[PDB]
């Protein structure tokens, strides 16, 4: 998040590095998470839904690879 201006660095690329570092640290995401209190049931349920969807998309990738269309 802390960025220093190097030599031959215009404001354009300076702000781009700022923004890119913002996602990499993820700071905006974690602020939105703590914006509201979430129940242990709720994080467990959301993570379980996330896990099943990642896994479902995972094997759907191989099934689409192994199937033949037209």
């Amino acid at each position: 998040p802390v960025i220093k201006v190097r030599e031959n660095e215009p404001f354009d690329v300076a702000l781009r590095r700022f923004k890119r570092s913002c996602e990499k640290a993820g700071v905006l995401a974690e602020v939105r998470r703590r914006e509201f209190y979430e129940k242990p049931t709720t994080e467990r349920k959301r993570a379980k839904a996330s896990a099943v969807k990642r896994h479902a998309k995972k094997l759907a990738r191989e099934n689409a690879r192994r199937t033949r269309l037209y």
């Binding site: 201006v5 300076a14 700071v27 905006l28 939105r32 914006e35």
Partner: protein, 117 residues
């Protein structure tokens, strides 16, 4: 009045209003501006244009101090935490540093209950 030529701007952009405050190195506030002060009401303050208009008015309120080099400390998740940057840049300041100063708790204290709108 007192000419020092170097300061730091602070951009606290909440989800509803953004506030810009240029201060000296050790934190004595030189000037400030805000979206509500710029003359907007309701969601108009939240819009990044409000943040855009607030940055010129906060630079042209410190312009009597002769400041040209300044850092920027960006805090808050609200929209307009990118608009004020180039707004200040356009006003004519040689941006020295950019630093994200948003407070991320290491999961201490309890947030308010979810809004059931």
């Amino acid at each position: 009045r007192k000419q020092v030529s170097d300061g730091v701007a602070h951009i606290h952009a909440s989800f509803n209003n953004t506030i810009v405050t240029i201060t000296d190195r050790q934190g004595n506030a030189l000037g400030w501006a805000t979206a509500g002060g710029s003359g907007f009401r309701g969601s108009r303050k939240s819009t990044p244009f409000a943040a855009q208009v607030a940055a010129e008015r906060c630079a042209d309120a410190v312009k009597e101090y002769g400041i040209k080099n300044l850092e920027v400390m960006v805090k808050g998740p609200g929209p307009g935490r990118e608009s004020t940057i180039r707004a200040l840049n356009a006003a004519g300041f040689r941006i020295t540093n950019i630093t994200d100063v948003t407070p991320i708790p290491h999961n201490g204290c309890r947030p308010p209950k979810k809004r059931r709108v």
